[PDB]
Amino acid sequence: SGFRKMAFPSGKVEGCMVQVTCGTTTLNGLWLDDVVYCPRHVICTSEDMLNPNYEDLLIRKSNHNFLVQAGNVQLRVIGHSMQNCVLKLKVDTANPKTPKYKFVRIQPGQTFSVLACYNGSPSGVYQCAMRPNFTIKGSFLNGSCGSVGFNIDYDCVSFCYMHHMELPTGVHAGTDLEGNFYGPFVDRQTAQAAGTDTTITVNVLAWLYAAVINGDRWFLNRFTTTLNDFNLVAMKYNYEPLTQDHVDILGPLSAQTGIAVLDMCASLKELLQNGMNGRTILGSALLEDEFTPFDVVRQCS
Amino acid sequence: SGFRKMAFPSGKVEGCMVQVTCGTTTLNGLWLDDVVYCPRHVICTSEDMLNPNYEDLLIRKSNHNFLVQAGNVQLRVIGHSMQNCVLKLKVDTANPKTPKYKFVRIQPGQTFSVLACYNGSPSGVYQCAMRPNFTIKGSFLNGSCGSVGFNIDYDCVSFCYMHHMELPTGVHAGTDLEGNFYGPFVDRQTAQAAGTDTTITVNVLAWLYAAVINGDRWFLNRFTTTLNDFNLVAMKYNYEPLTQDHVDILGPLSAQTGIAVLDMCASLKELLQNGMNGRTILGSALLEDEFTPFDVVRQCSGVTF
Numbered sequence: 001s002g003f004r005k006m007a008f009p010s011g012k013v014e015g016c017m018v019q020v021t022c023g024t025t026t027l028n029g030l031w032l033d034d035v036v037y038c039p040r041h042v043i044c045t046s047e048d049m050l051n052p053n054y055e056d057l058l059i060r061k062s063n064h065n066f067l068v069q070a071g072n073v074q075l076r077v078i079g080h081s082m083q084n085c086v087l088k089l090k091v092d093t094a095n096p097k098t099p100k101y102k103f104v105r106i107q108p109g110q111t112f113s114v115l116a117c118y119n120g121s122p123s124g125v126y127q128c129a130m131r132p133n134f135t136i137k138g139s140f141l142n143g144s145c146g147s148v149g150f151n152i153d154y155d156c157v158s159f160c161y162m163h164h165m166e167l168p169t170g171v172h173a174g175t176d177l178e179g180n181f182y183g184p185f186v187d188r189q190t191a192q193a194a195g196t197d198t199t200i201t202v203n204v205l206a207w208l209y210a211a212v213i214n215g216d217r218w219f220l221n222r223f224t225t226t227l228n229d230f231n232l233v234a235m236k237y238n239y240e241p242l243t244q245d246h247v248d249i250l251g252p253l254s255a256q257t258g259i260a261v262l263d264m265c266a267s268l269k270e271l272l273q274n275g276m277n278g279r280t281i282l283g284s285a286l287l288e289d290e291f292t293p294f295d296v297v298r299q300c301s
Numbered sequence: 302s303g304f305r306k307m308a309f310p311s312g313k314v315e316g317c318m319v320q321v322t323c324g325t326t327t328l329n330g331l332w333l334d335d336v337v338y339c340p341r342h343v344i345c346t347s348e349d350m351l352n353p354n355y356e357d358l359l360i361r362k363s364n365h366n367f368l369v370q371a372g373n374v375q376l377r378v379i380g381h382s383m384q385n386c387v388l389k390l391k392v393d394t395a396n397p398k399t400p401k402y403k404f405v406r407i408q409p410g411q412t413f414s415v416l417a418c419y420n421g422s423p424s425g426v427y428q429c430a431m432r433p434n435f436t437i438k439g440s441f442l443n444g445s446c447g448s449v450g451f452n453i454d455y456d457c458v459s460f461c462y463m464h465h466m467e468l469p470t471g472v473h474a475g476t477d478l479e480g481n482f483y484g485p486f487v488d489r490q491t492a493q494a495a496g497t498d499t500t501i502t503v504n505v506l507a508w509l510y511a512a513v514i515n516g517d518r519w520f521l522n523r524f525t526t527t528l529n530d531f532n533l534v535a536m537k538y539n540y541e542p543l544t545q546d547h548v549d550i551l552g553p554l555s556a557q558t559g560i561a562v563l564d565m566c567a568s569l570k571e572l573l574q575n576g577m578n579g580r581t582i583l584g585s586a587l588l589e590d591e592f593t594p595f596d597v598v599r600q601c602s603g604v605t606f
């Protein structure tokens with residue numbers, strides 16, 4: 001019993017974190033096999049950040065301009081290339097702690113663990129979700145760039161996020177490990193803003209199923225709803241539309257608890273209307289949206 | 302910016318988790334140097350649990366009755382002894398991944414990271430606090446016994462918790478690594494219950510300072526209070542008393558934000574007496590008490606391990 005915001009054990013990723021320095025800028029890199037991945041903005045000064053021409057700035061760098069530190073050992077950079085917004089530094093030593101890994105680009109609503117790092121040293125681990133507006137509500141300070149997000153279903157680390165920037169509202173933007181940003185963000189200090197965010201409906205439903213599995217039923221009701229009427233109500237509270245894919249994904253949890261997906265949608269509609277009336281659900285006074293249906297099944301089973 | 306419930310990086314602990322089997326029971330063990338630590342109830346059948354005589358049950362076991370698996374490698378048990386509610390299995394191989402470590406017993410209100418494990422394999426990491434009623438609000442399923450809680454102080458892992466039991470309300474009970482239970486619990490299948498819990502006041506104040514550091518100030522007010530008047534309110538709302546030690550510990554956060562501890566107490570007093578009025582603090586509609594003052598400073602200043 002119990003339901004916590006749970007991160008994957010970070011050990012496999014901790015053994016990949018390195019410090020990357022270029023000039024006066026220091027951030028984190030991810031060392032996998034003989035390559036260190038890091039944000040390409042490590043080659044910029046604060047001045048270069050408004051309209052950097054990364055191809056032009058990079059062509060001027062030599063391998064010895066990149067200082068990579070793995071623990072108390074300097075790694076020798078022997079090549080470099082840019083892939084989208086990520087810099088790939090070829091080093092002369094393969095990371096002996098390289099886990100079984102893959103690069104995966106996630107969709108909004110998906111969750112992952114973040115291993116926040118500073119100076120190539122891990123500081124903490126926490127659980128995030130890719131918001132519908134393509135930002136993450138992380139906890140990152142200056143020096144955290146290059147920290148990564150990942151999942152470890154099985155013993156294979158699926159890297160899905162590399163941290164690049166903090167937006168004015170204090171939320172975070174980054175790329176997948178191929179250097180493609182999530183959302184319409186650019187690695188420039190030009191005016192950028194997070195779009196209006198919405199609640200991840202399918203995840204709230206998953207968390208309500210987690211609450212039912214854990215013995216909480218106070219929010220259930222005798223009603224059901226059509227998917228279209230649910231979406232008309234959902235959107236008035238800034239909830240994401242629930243698609244037939246989301247209804248299908250919730251199938252297993254629905255079968256396990258005996259509560260049809262559209263029956264749980266009717267509970268959610270009532271919670272949006274009424275609030276919790278001084279009650280909590282799984283220790284929360286707000287509807288939680290950073291647990292996916294997959295997370296709920298993994299944690300409760 | 303941002304403020305998350307953050308656990309310590311678990312790698313140093315992951316390299317210590319092993320699977321311990323005794324008869325039909327499989328649970329987790331902690332392998333440090335040449336010893337595997339695990340709950341002494343691993344030797345009990347469900348019937349033994351009703352009223353166990355652990356010394357009597359243990360004397361009947363041989364070293365070969367304990368099967369210890371570290372990854373895909375079987376460790377050889379060469380001795381066994383009990384220390385309070387923990388079983389210590391001497392193995393013939395020292396764990397080469399043994400980190401710098403200590404065994405520490407924490408106080409209620411202290412937070413720690415839990416590495417939940419099943420079959421000697423780490424499954425997840427989460428942060429929690431030792432409640433004032435000595436339980437933890439964990440997330441544990443069957444097979445999770447022997448999972449451990451820890452903190453990291455510089456390069457040293459301080460192991461503070463080993464999981465043993467789930468109480469009827471779904472909260473958890475365990476021991477320190479010397480096998481002493483936190484709370485008035487016993488490792489026996491007999492009627493036990495979590496006592497009435499209270500809120501960890503010093504931690505709520507620390508989290509209010511974290512909210513201020515992160516740009517949330519709506520709850521601040523022009524008022525201050527005395528420590529005695531604050532404690533009279535805190536007692537009324539099932540909050541733990543705030544001591545001068547707690548006030549001293551909050552000193553740094555008080556100096557950084559410009560909000561004196563008793564000035565923040567006046568904000569808390571008003572929050573208790575009037576609620577949040579539809580507002581949230583750091584994305585929460587409840588006052589969060591599972592961040593210590595040290596956790597707040599560590600997260601808002603970026604300490605690494």
Ligand SMILES: O=C(Nc1cncc2c1CNCC2)[C@@H]1CCOc2ccc(Cl)cc21
Binds near residue numbers: 041049143144164165
């Ligand atoms: O945001 C950035 N880094 C950073 C990362 N995470 C947390 C925080 C910060 C900044 N200070 C608050 C906390 C840098 C700074 C300049 O502006 C840009 C613009 C574009 C890019 Cl790709 C990166 C950056």
Ligand SMILES: O=C(Nc1cncc2c1CNCC2)[C@@H]1CCOc2ccc(Cl)cc21
Binds near residue numbers: 446466467
């Ligand atoms: O509580 C126990 N273990 C367990 C551990 N964590 C989570 C869960 C469980 C049980 N099923 C729900 C989830 C065992 C079961 C029998 O009763 C006792 C009695 C005493 C002791 Cl020390 C241990 C136990």
Ligand SMILES: [Cl-]
Binds near residue numbers: 106110
């Ligand atoms: Cl995805």
